[PDB]
């Protein structure tokens, strides 16, 4: 349904504390919406951290 799940469109690796590593075609859910960077949870490992919004695709499904 309508939600805040995005898909990593590029490979990346965790760096800061609450960070999250994803791949070029991975799927992650969003926990909140800020602006430049958002906090999401990768279902591939039930983990969660930051995700560059400029390198991802946000969908509500």
Swiss-Prot record:
Tissue specificity of this protein: Detected in monocytes and neutrophils (at protein level). Expressed predominantly in cells of the myeloid and B-lymphoid lineages. Highly expressed in granulocytes. Detected in tonsil.
Signals that turn on the gene: Up-regulated during myeloid cell differentiation. The highest levels are detected in fully differentiated phagocytes. Up-regulated by IL2.
PTM field: Phosphorylated on several tyrosine residues. Autophosphorylated. Becomes rapidly phosphorylated upon activation of the immunoglobulin receptors FCGR1A and FCGR2A. Phosphorylation by the BCR-ABL fusion protein mediates activation of HCK.
Domain SH3 residues, every copy: 1-61
Subcellular location: Cytoplasmic vesicle, Secretory vesicle; Cytoplasm, Cytosol
Domain statement: The SH3 domain mediates binding to HIV-1 Nef.
Functional description taken from the UniProt entry: Non-receptor tyrosine-protein kinase found in hematopoietic cells that transmits signals from cell surface receptors and plays an important role in the regulation of innate immune responses, including neutrophil, monocyte, macrophage and mast cell functions, phagocytosis, cell survival and proliferation, cell adhesion and migration. Acts downstream of receptors that bind the Fc region of immunoglobulins, such as FCGR1A and FCGR2A, but also CSF3R, PLAUR, the receptors for IFNG, IL2, IL6 and IL8, and integrins, such as ITGB1 and ITGB2.
Family: Belongs to the protein kinase superfamily. Tyr protein kinase family. SRC subfamily.
Implicated disorder: Aberrant activation of HCK by HIV-1 protein Nef enhances HIV-1 replication and contributes to HIV-1 pathogenicity. Aberrant activation of HCK, e.g. by the BCR-ABL fusion protein, promotes cancer cell proliferation.
Subunit structure: Interacts (via SH2 domain) with FLT3 (tyrosine phosphorylated). Interacts with VAV1, WAS and RAPGEF1. This interaction stimulates its tyrosine-kinase activity. Interacts with ARRB1 and ARRB2. Interacts with ADAM15. Interacts with FASLG. Interacts with CBL. Interacts with FCGR1A; the interaction may be indirect. Interacts with IL6ST. Interacts (via SH3 domain) with ELMO1. Interacts (via SH3 domain) with TP73. Interacts with YAP1. Interacts with ABL1 and ITGB1, and thereby recruits ABL1 to activated ITGB1. Interacts (via SH3 domain) with WDCP. (Microbial infection) Interacts (via SH3 domain) with HEV ORF3 protein.
Record-given protein name: Tyrosine-protein kinase HCK
Organism: Homo sapiens (Human)
Gene behind this protein: HCK
Residues of the full protein shown: 78 to 138 of 526
